[PDB]
């Protein structure tokens, strides 16, 4: 039970558990193509987790045969935004798979995220955001780490994806190998657009230091600290 | 005698040694504004070195009062390119100052460059290039690390500048603090434009691995490896 959807209108529904892997029927995408999913708890164990973005039944990598997701009402999500609404931090110890149509993937958890052997399957871009998504009259305008001092931690087992990767947090402490098509890490207290452009930055009252003690297997790495040890 | 100009037409002339600091009267800039200076040996010790890009006498940071450089013929350089023509690697243990008009600064040495407590004063951008500048009919077209396996090493005393910084080499091994307005590091066997756009990349027969074991005090860091441990 690592993933516990919210009971409200943006809470998705668990549709299967196959060999220990939770399968999440994400909520209907909005007119911008965003499936905005809310959770009281969001954690992935070794068996991984599947996010069902499929209009046809077929074979998943992590959970065997899966069905179409009727919540999609005929249109797959462009962006799967997973948002923790409680005070609970997230632990990611395995792979998150988008089943069906490839999409962008975001996990936001302003309380903290730890990835230790996590990864992302069938995503064009995946982002881990220790911060709040900013919605304005229902539209996603970006993300905020303002006033936040919490940590994105990457453990010794690292992070892997074939797609693009964004790491957004007040501070980042990484101790393992990060494999991605491109790595963009943005630290400090910032506001961001939906595309992770930095729109504003603020000075924290105390230092927010970040540490990258592992390795980076990627052809392009960008690190922006608006408030870096290697 | 850390800096030994070439005897040919692109060799600059030492115009003073003030408190152990060599003062180099760079050669006349060409019509693109490039002062292309060639050296049999290029090394900077603790006292630093000054590159005279001045149309008026005045006070240098490293070498006291200095005169105008008559080689400029009334026009300061836009880019001061220092190029080692021999097989000798370069060691930079102190500051390189542009006296007079601020300019871009490049040191190229395809045999290897080591910076340990080096830095750059009065430069808009400084670049260390373990590679060859590419001139086509007298015009600077960029730089090449093709076929090169040599090392850019940054030691425990680090590198400091208030301007932009580019680090270009087949491999980079850094063990100290790099302070710069922005840091761009490009590793592998590549061809580059004059602005360090990557125009081509090639696969080395054996791995070229890079290491950044120090820290980076900069708001923007980009690392591109076309063939990275932190």
Curated annotation (Swiss-Prot), chains A, B:
Cellular localisation: Cell outer membrane
Other known facts: The conserved amphipathic domains in ShlA and HpmA may be responsible for pore formation.
Function description: Bacterial hemolysins are exotoxins that attack blood cell membranes and cause cell rupture by mechanisms not clearly defined. Cell-bound hemolysin, which releases heme-iron from erythrocytes by interaction with the erythrocyte membrane. HpmA requires HpmB function.
Protein name stated in the entry: Hemolysin
Source organism phylogeny: Bacteria, Pseudomonadati, Pseudomonadota, Gammaproteobacteria, Enterobacterales
Originating gene: hpmA
């Amino acid at each position: 039970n690592g993933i516990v959807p919210d009971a409200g209108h943006q809470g998705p529904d668990v549709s299967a558990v196959n060999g220990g892997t939770q399968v999440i029927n994400i909520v209907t995408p909005n007119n911008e193509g965003i499936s905005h999913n809310q959770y009281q708890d969001f954690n992935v164990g070794k068996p991984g987790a599947v996010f069902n973005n499929a209009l046809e039944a077929g074979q998943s990598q992590l959970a065997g045969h899966l069905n179409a997701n009727s919540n999609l009402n005929g249109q797959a999500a462009s962006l799967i935004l997973n948002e923790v609404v409680s005070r609970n931090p997230s632990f990611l110890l395995g792979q998150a798979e988008v089943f069906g149509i490839a999409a962008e993937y975001v996990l936001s958890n302003p309380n903290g995220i730890t990835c230790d052997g996590c990864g992302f399957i069938n995503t064009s871009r995946s982002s881990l955001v220790v911060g709040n998504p900013l919605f304005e009259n229902g539209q996603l305008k970006g993300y905020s780490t303002l006033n936040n001092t919490n940590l994105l931690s990457l453990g010794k087992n690292g992070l892997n994806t074939t797609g693009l990767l964004d790491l957004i947090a007040p501070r980042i402490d990484s101790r393992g190998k990060i494999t991605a098509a491109e790595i963009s890490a943005f630290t400090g207290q910032n506001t961001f657009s939906q595309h992770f452009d930095i729109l504003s930055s603020q000075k924290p009252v105390s230092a927010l230091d970040s540490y990258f003690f592992g390795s980076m297997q990627s052809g392009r790495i960008r690190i922006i600290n608006t408030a870096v040890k290697l």
